[PDB]
Nucleic acid binder design. Structure first.
Ligand SMILES: [Mg+2]
Ligand SMILES: [Mg+2]
Ligand SMILES: [Mg+2]
Ligand SMILES: [Mg+2]
Ligand SMILES: [Mg+2]
Ligand SMILES: [Mg+2]
Ligand SMILES: [Mg+2]
Ligand SMILES: [Mg+2]
Ligand SMILES: [Mg+2]
Ligand SMILES: [Mg+2]
Ligand SMILES: [Mg+2]
Ligand SMILES: [Mg+2]
Ligand SMILES: [Mg+2]
Ligand SMILES: [Mg+2]
Ligand SMILES: [Mg+2]
Ligand SMILES: [Mg+2]
Ligand SMILES: [Mg+2]
Ligand SMILES: [Mg+2]
Ligand SMILES: [Mg+2]
Ligand SMILES: [Mg+2]
Ligand SMILES: [Mg+2]
Ligand SMILES: [Mg+2]
Ligand SMILES: [Mg+2]
Ligand SMILES: [Mg+2]
Ligand SMILES: [Mg+2]
Ligand SMILES: [Mg+2]
Ligand SMILES: [Mg+2]
Ligand SMILES: [Mg+2]
Ligand SMILES: [Mg+2]
Ligand SMILES: [Mg+2]
Ligand SMILES: [Mg+2]
Ligand SMILES: [Mg+2]
Ligand SMILES: [Mg+2]
Ligand SMILES: [Mg+2]
Ligand SMILES: [Mg+2]
Ligand SMILES: [Mg+2]
Ligand SMILES: [Mg+2]
Ligand SMILES: [Mg+2]
Lengths: 260, 155
RNA sequence: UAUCUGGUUGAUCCUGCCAGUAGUCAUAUGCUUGUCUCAAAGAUUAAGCCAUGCAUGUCUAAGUAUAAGCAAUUUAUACAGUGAAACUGCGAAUGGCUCAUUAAAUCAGUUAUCGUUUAUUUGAUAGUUCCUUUACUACAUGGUAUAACUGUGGUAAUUCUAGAGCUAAUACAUGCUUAAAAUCUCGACCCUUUGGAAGAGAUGUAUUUAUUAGAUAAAAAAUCAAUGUCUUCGGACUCUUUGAUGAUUCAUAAUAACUUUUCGAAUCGCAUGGCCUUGUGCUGGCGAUGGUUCAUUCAAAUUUCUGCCCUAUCAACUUUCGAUGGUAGGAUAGUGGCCUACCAUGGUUUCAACGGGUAACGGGGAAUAAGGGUUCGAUUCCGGAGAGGGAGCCUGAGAAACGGC
RNA sequence: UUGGCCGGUCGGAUUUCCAACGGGGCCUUUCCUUCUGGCUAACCUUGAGUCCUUGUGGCUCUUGGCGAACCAGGACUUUUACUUUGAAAAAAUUAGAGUGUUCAAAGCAGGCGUAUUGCUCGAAUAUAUUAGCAUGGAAUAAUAGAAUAGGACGUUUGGUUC
RNA sequence: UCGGCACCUUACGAGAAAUCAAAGUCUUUGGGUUCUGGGGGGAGUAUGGUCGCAAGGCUGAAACUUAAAGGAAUUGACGGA
RNA sequence: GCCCGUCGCUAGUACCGAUUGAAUGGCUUAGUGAGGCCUCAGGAUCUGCUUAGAGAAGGGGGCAACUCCAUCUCAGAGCGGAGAAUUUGGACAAACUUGGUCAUUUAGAGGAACUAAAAGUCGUAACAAGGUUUCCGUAGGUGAACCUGCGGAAGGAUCAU
RNA sequence: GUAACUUCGGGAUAAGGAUUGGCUCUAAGGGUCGGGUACGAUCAACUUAGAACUGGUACGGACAAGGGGAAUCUGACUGU
């Protein structure tokens, strides 16, 4: 023990990175960064396991040390850089802009976007609080501190960050009828906006959400990410829109497109 | 606890940072600080119009109630400003598919707002470690009747 | 894969165990052994002892190069490339190995930090540096004091080092220049009073204390320090800024100070632009690396609730060397009997405390299983403990560290 | 929800034509602790008009409209057990979907052309108990309430505090 | 008719049977609850505690040994029946 | 027929037992008490100023307003810093010595048993009315199985006047 | 702090182990005085506990004053 750990055991990794059990004893430990260790996705996992551009973890080093990848417009040459939720990942060569979003299985989608959507991102307001000299600041889910917000911005909301100058462009208030991206647990990757929100003063606020197919699913408020109004997402949603087709319906589609 | 020996102590018992200005005569003559502990637990009036200090009181003192809220029956009031309450429960053994009576005793700080006694069901709320053992302060006393008005000597 | 069978009798029917029967990711051992895949392996017994060798070092255009090194420069007479050594920084607190302690202890799930520390990461963040301004010192840039090194040595021997002489910094120690306004306090210059003023200082951020604000049920009024800044001198003044949390003495801000005064860049690479007082004048880009605070991230510490094997040939245990609580202090990173001082007499237990045993680390889990159970889990993951035993400590964000003392 | 019969698609959409389950409301003497202000009720109340060929399946600026179709405070709370549902619950293992590792133990791969400028599916889910959190029920098993009435109900006294 | 000590007959049932209206309502296994047993010996022994003036009482082992001990009934055999 | 013991052969297992028997692990009254830390001191050195005394060196506008920052030979009345050995006092506390106590293991002359176990000797106590009906509690007596008193039971050899 | 054993009364001061001076203090522990048809004058005593400071670590400073333990025999004991 005696301090911070520097190693991640494979099979002690978060399961949603889809790392193979064999062929290597260790996992890429997420570095310190904007997102938590179990809620992030290291760049080696993205560029070798999700995009298949690198074969080894050495070619992830040979990519990052040519200033190719940039998370949020900044290069981040760390191999184990903890790129997490809503992070825009730009590749200059290949011209590919990705946004790290959850597919409905609870994993990280290989989801391309375009440049006007790559120019910004979203961030769930963690806290609103006065800083020193009286300056108000808001804290986002990637730990960004942005000063002088709109005074209407409260906790559990969402702000649109301009990502060149890290400025709040506009904000989506947290209220009923607004697209909730569930960001943790078994409901990871599910959209659906509302039923209502139940309070529980004391801890662990719960939010009821019913998707396009009218499936209600209760989620804790600390897994809720607001991503738009009714309809009209503020980002490009992944291939499947977070609907949770059951395995009976999942076997129905794959047989519907394996005979063509 | 407005009267009856607030000061019986080697140190001066006062609330921290509550300045009584002696020049400006405001017609209370002692500023008193209170809060609500939250979660619907009312601040009793005998804390407001009483004058105890209790640095570990959830209303007038510097402890914040947070975490588990439990309920239990007071069994022992023989310390000063502390009680132990009995948390009776049933524990299930799966082999017999049956339950057994277990209990745990929890020592709880009692503020001098309340007048607890034994055999009183009481609501207690977690705080920081008050003592070696105590982590809970009485937030609400749940005694109503006690069946004690019908027992004494008769004509 | 919900199965029984052999054994008591002259014979029978039982109770009943013995024996057979089948697994074992369960060890050892005997015999035998051709192919391919897969692969536990000094746990038990001795956490008993250890020869030898290795297991932790690290250099980019970007802290320091006069190697008396090499290549041999690219106005390159300050250097220019490469770079041993050494200084500086960072790491060495991860890994790995083992299971000896350890029976509400660890651990597992579940709370808490409104009870704290946190390198690194990431995001923000610093016009104030003048001692007592009308007693400022280079900022076109401060100082000594050292390594490596040269040379002279001791010891049989150690990753021992001595004396002398050199020399750098992103090491060490000092120390400035980057507006302008407001608002206070002081202040040479108010006649018959709801009668002021150049100037002089201070006001960044750390520290520590005290005090203040951090608000709120909707509206109306006539008296008494109060013409509270009511203008035809009564033409009732038409007026509330304040974030957060379930909850605060929270965040924050202000007033008076306080300090063996912390920080506020005496640092490096590349590119060499542009402007007009052509002076090597003024502005100038992309970085690197430091730095204060607040959040973040990796953590750490303590923590709520509930749960663990056998034993009463263990029924009372804890309280002089804290037991249980209160009050105050000290210590801590902080809560807290953590310790100290004083005061009270508590706290636990037949719902098994206290004690004793364990060839006991805990859990995920494993073997067998109709169902329920029974037994194992030292061991590929997670948490704990330990490096022969104990105890203490330095450094560092992080260790009571052991490939440190 | 079994479907359920134009069988017109040479025994393959459909639907009150219904019966049995499974829920939600309303009323019968029938709690829904509660006043506030943003809803302005499937509008308790229907000025103005039903240009559709006859019905009990298809509407407007409305006469101040039980401002009661959910957001934060109380003259605000009898407590459990039980059971359902759901989060949150490390992976590996176990059960288990997919997939010719040549089979299998395994593994999480893989599959498909025009193989020339390459297209594309996955990596599910269940269980994971006991304790804790929320949630629907209110049988069963407790507990409490008014008997010396210190009882419950009252929108138009406000006293030593507020 | 209430309660009791028993009995008689049958055996629905129960049991291995002898028998039993309880010893039944028991693989169609759950009314409530206390104590005890786990093949025979060693052995109610050793040791420890405890009680008693003591005799002894209560609690109470293990090593080791053993393939049967036992229960009920049948047929025989034998009886100084 | 079966069967009980006394005594005897061989082998094994535990029990009591002088020996304050021995060994490991504790845990603990006490005494001594290393080392590091903090602390009261200390000051070998190893320096930077500066002198009211020669310190052979202008007082940092200037050698008339008692006003303008000012250094070598040595003692220093002026200081100021770093500081090693050593030392006081604490608190943590290794370890040693001694006693008490707990638990486990191990040695012991000998004593008191049990078993293998069927076989030797002696009687025949039980099983038949087993030749004195048996068994239970208790007491006493006996080579001994046992015998006898007292009370019980029927598992009696009597379900019956 | 205290064992075996015990006639349960003892063994027992078992065995063992710490402290003790001086000075300056602190804290308890009394008596007499009194009410309206929310009170302290006054006097006196030596016990006990605690603290600091102090010293060639001395201190029951002379005096005074048990050695203790494990066994065996023997008589119960006090007594003669
Ligand atoms: Mg490790
Ligand atoms: Mg306490
Ligand atoms: Mg067997
Ligand atoms: Mg071959
Ligand atoms: Mg070993
Ligand atoms: Mg092992
Ligand atoms: Mg072991
Ligand atoms: Mg070793
Ligand atoms: Mg380089
Ligand atoms: Mg290894
Ligand atoms: Mg780092
Ligand atoms: Mg650098
Ligand atoms: Mg205290
Ligand atoms: Mg305290
Ligand atoms: Mg305190
Ligand atoms: Mg062990
Ligand atoms: Mg285990
Ligand atoms: Mg284990
Ligand atoms: Mg360690
Ligand atoms: Mg370090
Ligand atoms: Mg160590
Ligand atoms: Mg190590
Ligand atoms: Mg080692
Ligand atoms: Mg298979
Ligand atoms: Mg009758
Ligand atoms: Mg037996
Ligand atoms: Mg017995
Ligand atoms: Mg005995
Ligand atoms: Mg005979
Ligand atoms: Mg006879
Ligand atoms: Mg007979
Ligand atoms: Mg018998
Ligand atoms: Mg003595
Ligand atoms: Mg003696
Ligand atoms: Mg005599
Ligand atoms: Mg005689
Ligand atoms: Mg005699
Ligand atoms: Mg005599």
């Amino acid at each position: 023990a005696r301090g911070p750990k520097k190693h991640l055991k494979r099979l002690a990794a978060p399961h949603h990175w889809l790392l193979d059990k064999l062929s290597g004893c260790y996992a890429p430990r997420p570095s310190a960064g904007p997102h938590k260790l179990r809620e992030s996705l290291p760049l080696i996992v993205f560029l070798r396991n999700r995009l298949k551009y690198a074969l080894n973890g050495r070619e992830v080093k040979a990519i990052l040390m040519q200033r190719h990848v940039k998370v949020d417009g900044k290069v981040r040459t760390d191999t184990t850089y903890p790129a997490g939720f809503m992070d825009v990942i730009t590749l200059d060569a290949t011209n590919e802009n990705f946004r790290l979003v959850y597919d409905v299985k609870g994993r990280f989608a290989v989801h391309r976007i375009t440049d006007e959507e790559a120019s910004y991102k979203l961030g769930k307001v963690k806290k609103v609080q006065l800083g020193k000299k009286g300056v108000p600041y808001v804290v986002t889910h990637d730990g960004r501190t942005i000063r002088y917000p709109d005074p209407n911005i409260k906790v559990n909301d969402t702000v649109k960050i301009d990502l060149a100058s890290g400025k709040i462009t506009d904000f989506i208030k947290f209220d009923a009828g607004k697209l909730v991206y569930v960001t943790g647990g078994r409901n990871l990757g599910r959209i659906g906006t509302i039923v209502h929100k139940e309070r529980h003063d004391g801890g662990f606020d719960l939010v009821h959400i019913k998707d396009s197919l009218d499936n209600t699913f209760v989620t804790r408020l600390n897994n809720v990410f607001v991503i738009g109004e009714q309809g009209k997402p503020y980002i490009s949603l992944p291939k499947g829109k977070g609907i949770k087709l059951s395995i009976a319906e999942e076997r129905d589609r794959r047989r519907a497109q394996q005979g063509l | 606890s407005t009267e009856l020996t607030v000061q019986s102590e080697r140190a001066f018992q006062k609330q921290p940072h509550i300045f009584n200005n002696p020049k400006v005569k405001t017609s209370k003559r002692t500023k008193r600080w209170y809060k609500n502990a939250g979660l619907g637990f009312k601040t009793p009036k005998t804390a407001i119009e009483g004058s105890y200090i209790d640095k570990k009181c959830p209303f007038t003192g510097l402890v914040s109630i947070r975490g588990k809220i439990l309920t239990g029956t007071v069994v022992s009031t023989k310390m000063h400003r502390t009680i132990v309450i009995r948390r009776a429960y049933l524990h299930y053994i799966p082999k017999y598919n049956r339950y057994e009576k277990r209990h745990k005793n929890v020592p709880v700080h009692v503020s001098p707002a309340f007048r607890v006694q034994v055999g009183d069901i009481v609501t207690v709320g977690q705080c920081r470690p008050i003592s070696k053992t105590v982590r809970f302060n009485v937030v609400k006393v749940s005694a109503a009747a006690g069946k004690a008005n019908k027992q004494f000597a008769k004509f």
